[PDB]
Design an enzyme around this catalytic site. Sequence first.
Site, PDB file in Angstrom:
ATOM      1  CG  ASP A 130      -1.796   1.185   1.345  1.00  6.64           C
ATOM      2  OD1 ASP A 130      -1.905   1.925   0.341  1.00  6.64           O
ATOM      3  OD2 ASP A 130      -2.416   1.358   2.430  1.00  6.64           O
ATOM      4  CB  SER A 170      -2.305  14.276 -13.473  1.00  5.19           C
ATOM      5  OG  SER A 170      -2.734  14.036 -14.801  1.00  5.19           O
TER       6      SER A 170
END
Length: 330
Positions: free
Chosen positions: A35, A199
């Site tokens: 994770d 992004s």
Amino acid sequence: STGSATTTPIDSLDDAYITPVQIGTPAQTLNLDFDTGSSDLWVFSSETTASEVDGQTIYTPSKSTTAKLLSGATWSISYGDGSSSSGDVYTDTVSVGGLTVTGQAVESAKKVSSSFTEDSTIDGLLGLAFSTLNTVSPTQQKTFFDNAKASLDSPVFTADLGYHAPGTYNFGFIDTTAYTGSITYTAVSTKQGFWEWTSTGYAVGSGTFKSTSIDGIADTGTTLLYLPATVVSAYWAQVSGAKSSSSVGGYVFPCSATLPSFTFGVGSARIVIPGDYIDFGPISTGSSSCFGGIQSSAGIGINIFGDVALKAAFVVFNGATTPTLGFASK
């Protein structure tokens, strides 16, 4: 040193991925959920409340000759989806894919929430976010990656998740046969303890690319792609019959639909998520309403590039003095 381990979807929907991990001496092999969105290595154990264990493999520290109780140490974690676990702490030898760390904090669960109990395939989590998020008290502990870093050939790990198929976690090297083209690297902020990056935008299907900054985290421990409501609405508007259902808890769509791809930007590069990766199947057995793999982050407080996004790429988690993230198509 390096390590290399295969990671395997837990079910037909890729709801999560498990990777075998050797703990203790002799080795006890547990299947852990790696994770990158948390920083605790915790396991089901011989200390876990018996009624809360349903099929998991447990770590028994009393059977490990290298286990040592970390005196006074406790831990307690809560995840965004409302799940949780807590317990005490041992140090022991932990190996992943041939890479060994001695003195790793192994957090033994005394209590786990129902969602963990119900997940018979997941024996615990291995956190790979920054150690500043580790929950051990009163002495915070380091992640497996942090402990391994100085010994690795290169201070990196990579995530290569498969779509309905096994993939690979590598530590200490970049497998140049595992991706196509070049890897595009992008800046990371560690200010929130995550692999947080921005992004450069998105496209829906064959549509034009929208240049817009989307701050979010690269999180292997989250199933879906959570993005701003505007982006998500633009995606599902291209699927006839798709709608946001408060009763279901997100966007659903007719199972008869063909889903469009979703592209996200990494600098000037582009990663394409095929439409099929966005299908999470019937909302309930036999239903013709299917759950979407792109959902709104509104009210999470952060955008999350979860498995839906990451499995479309070869992803480099570069833990150099100034960390960065790299993405390649594959």
